[PDB]
Design a protein around this nucleic acid. Structure first.
Ligand SMILES: [Mg+2]
Ligand SMILES: [Mg+2]
Ligand SMILES: [Mg+2]
Ligand SMILES: [Mg+2]
Ligand SMILES: [Mg+2]
Ligand SMILES: [Mg+2]
Ligand SMILES: [Mg+2]
Ligand SMILES: [Mg+2]
Ligand SMILES: [Mg+2]
Ligand SMILES: [Mg+2]
Ligand SMILES: [Mg+2]
Ligand SMILES: [Mg+2]
Ligand SMILES: [Mg+2]
Ligand SMILES: [Mg+2]
Ligand SMILES: [Mg+2]
Ligand SMILES: [Mg+2]
Ligand SMILES: [Mg+2]
Ligand SMILES: [Mg+2]
Ligand SMILES: [Mg+2]
Ligand SMILES: [Mg+2]
Ligand SMILES: [Mg+2]
Ligand SMILES: [Mg+2]
Ligand SMILES: [Mg+2]
Ligand SMILES: [Mg+2]
Ligand SMILES: [Mg+2]
Ligand SMILES: [Mg+2]
Ligand SMILES: [Mg+2]
Ligand SMILES: [Mg+2]
Ligand SMILES: [Mg+2]
Ligand SMILES: [Mg+2]
Ligand SMILES: [Mg+2]
Ligand SMILES: [Mg+2]
Ligand SMILES: [Mg+2]
Ligand SMILES: [Mg+2]
Ligand SMILES: [Mg+2]
Ligand SMILES: [Mg+2]
Ligand SMILES: [Mg+2]
Ligand SMILES: [Mg+2]
Ligand SMILES: [Mg+2]
Ligand SMILES: [Mg+2]
Lengths: 116, 101, 87, 70
RNA sequence: GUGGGAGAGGGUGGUGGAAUUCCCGGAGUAGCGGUGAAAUGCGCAGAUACCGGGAGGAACGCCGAUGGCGAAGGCAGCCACCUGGUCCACCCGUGACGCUGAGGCGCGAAAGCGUGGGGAGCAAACCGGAUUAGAUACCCGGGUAGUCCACGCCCUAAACGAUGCGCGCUAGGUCUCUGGGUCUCCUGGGGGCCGAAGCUAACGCGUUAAGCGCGCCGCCUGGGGAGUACGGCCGCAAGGC
């Protein structure tokens, strides 16, 4: 019970899963969702379709809070990141602006052998 | 003696008396390390690219000095010690290399 | 560093005749100035090895010019040595 | 898609305090542009770099920016 | 000598922002993670995702180059100090002062050793999950030495251009870094690519020789046994010559 009017959405997409958090204009979460939040379990989570269903799920969950406008912020490069943004556009939430915040360092930390 | 530029970025939330007190300390510090002040530009309030100590803006102070080189690091130490001094950069002077002639 | 004025004082001190920039004497004096500055720099900064090689090379040059001078005019060589305080 | 130096007047490349001109050589992000985009020379670009990095530490230039659109 | 220059050459002290980890707070549920698929693991003592604050260590994105510097190993955020080498111009000074260099001395990536710090991320060993006929591995989840700093040892390598150093001499073209010039271009000093003559078993090399010559050093004389044994020297040890 909020009635948050407008707000913003974070799409954090990896190759293994896509997960979408929706928040107030101060960044505090309202609802979230993910591939596994819906039926998916294994590799299937990080599918683009799951990303769609996650985007949507989070969006409906958000409109229960009476959301209208949303600012999309994208992190990660993963399968169905853009499908998340796409479902999120047609989600009936009016998408105000999209942006890419994906973190990269200035070369701080040694990655895993998997990542060299 | 060598020619240097002294960059100082301090609290934009400062009032007159206190700001001019930080400036008193700056003058007294410079002059205490042997630095002679050739010229000073005071830009003051400016919008930073990124926040500094939670602040979106900064108050800029630029100096050009001639001072003993052995003393420069300690000078900048003394400048930094102030709570209200957010940033200090001392730079050896350079002839203004131009381009697009 | 060694400024112009210092270098010049050393030269006008060690020149054989006015205007002599390059005689063995002046050369050895200058070498010695640099050698002392460097050896001083290496007292602290014991860990700067590249600079040290620099100093090895300077000492090598000095030794060669001195070897030459002694071979040539032993008197000027004694004079140089005592004046500088080498060997 | 003209090069950055191409549109400008004579300007001190060594001056870290001039934001108006330096902002031209950054990206949409805070990335310092490639030579092909800045149209500078080896030595030029080399000095510009240090100048920009100076300006950043001073607080007048971005290290990084958010990428809009996408 | 004088006057200019470029540079991750070195040493000391500072300092900057991104990211990871952890801690504190807010908001917020039911999963997160991970793979070829999974599982271990983590999460209702509230994780993942998100915002704010803090602590800490390590490394410096773009610029970045087929680039630069260094004798080599190697060296890249920024700032100051301390300091090495080197190039060009002027043609000013000394007057063969030169080259090479057995031995000696110094330097010497990583790993490794000693004492004391430090410890975020990574991670031999190890402990688990999978895969497999088995899996002592590859893949996944943890994780200690170590990785980092100081001082002291160790002396190795595909320490590679697999090409010792210096000097002279033998077409050019094209790209490039950095000086000077009367700045189209010429002229030095580096880095590349094609190529004259020539060399080479061939591949290829060719003014950055593997060409033509001179000087000096190191080194080789079939494979395995074997970089072993023995001796000596060095080393705390591993071990090295
Ligand atoms: Mg998955
Ligand atoms: Mg302060
Ligand atoms: Mg000179
Ligand atoms: Mg220097
Ligand atoms: Mg350096
Ligand atoms: Mg350094
Ligand atoms: Mg918490
Ligand atoms: Mg549990
Ligand atoms: Mg439990
Ligand atoms: Mg800690
Ligand atoms: Mg690159
Ligand atoms: Mg070189
Ligand atoms: Mg120098
Ligand atoms: Mg002459
Ligand atoms: Mg004569
Ligand atoms: Mg030799
Ligand atoms: Mg070693
Ligand atoms: Mg090591
Ligand atoms: Mg140790
Ligand atoms: Mg592992
Ligand atoms: Mg196992
Ligand atoms: Mg098994
Ligand atoms: Mg791990
Ligand atoms: Mg131990
Ligand atoms: Mg060999
Ligand atoms: Mg030979
Ligand atoms: Mg030759
Ligand atoms: Mg020119
Ligand atoms: Mg050339
Ligand atoms: Mg050529
Ligand atoms: Mg060829
Ligand atoms: Mg030649
Ligand atoms: Mg040969
Ligand atoms: Mg035999
Ligand atoms: Mg044999
Ligand atoms: Mg062996
Ligand atoms: Mg024997
Ligand atoms: Mg033995
Ligand atoms: Mg023994
Ligand atoms: Mg061995």
């Amino acid at each position: 019970k909020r009635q948050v009017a407008s707000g913003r959405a974070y799409i954090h997409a990896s190759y293994n899963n896509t997960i979408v958090t929706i928040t107030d204009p101060d960044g505090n979460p309202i609802t979230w969702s993910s591939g596994g939040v819906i039926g998916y379990k294994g590799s299937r989570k990080g599918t683009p379709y799951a990303a769609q269903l996650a985007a949507l799920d989070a969006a409906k969950k958000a409109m229960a809070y009476g959301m209208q406008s949303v600012d999309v912020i994208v992190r990660g490069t993963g399968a169905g990141r853009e499908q998340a943004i796409r479902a999120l556009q047609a989600s009936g939430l009016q998408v105000k602006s999209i942006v890419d915040d994906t973190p990269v360092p200035h070369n701080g930390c040694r990655p895993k052998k998997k990542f060299r | 003696m060598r020619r240097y530029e002294v960059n100082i970025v301090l609290n934009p939330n400062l009032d007159q008396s206190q700001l001019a007190l930080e400036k008193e300390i700056i003058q007294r510090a410079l002059e205490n390390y042997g630095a002679r002040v050739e010229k000073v530009e005071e830009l003051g309030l400016r919008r930073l690219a990124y926040p500094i100590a939670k602040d979106p803006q900064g108050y800029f102070l630029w100096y050009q000095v001639e001072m003993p080189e052995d003393r420069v690091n300690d000078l900048a130490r003394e400048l930094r010690i102030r709570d209200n001094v957010r940033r200090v950069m001392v730079v050896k002077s350079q002839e203004p290399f131009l381009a697009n002639a | 560093p060694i400024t112009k004025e210092e270098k010049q004082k050393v030269i006008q001190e060690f020149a054989r005749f006015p205007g002599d920039t390059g005689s063995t004497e002046v050369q050895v004096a200058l070498l010695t100035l640099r050698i002392n500055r460097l050896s001083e720099h290496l007292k602290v900064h014991k860990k700067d090895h590249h600079s040290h090689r620099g100093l090895l090379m300077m000492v090598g040059q000095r030794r060669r010019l001195l070897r030459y001078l002694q071979r040539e005019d032993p008197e000027r060589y004694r004079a140089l040595i005592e004046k500088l305080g080498i060997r | 898609k003209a090069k950055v130096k191409a549109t400008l007047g004579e300007f001190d490349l060594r001056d870290y305090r001039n934001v108006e001109v330096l902002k031209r050589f950054l990206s949409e992000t805070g990335k310092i542009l490639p030579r092909r985009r800045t149209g500078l020379s080896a030595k030029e670009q080399r000095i510009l770099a240090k100048t920009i990095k100076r300006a950043r530490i001073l607080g007048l230039l971005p290290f990084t920016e958010k990428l809009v659109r996408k």
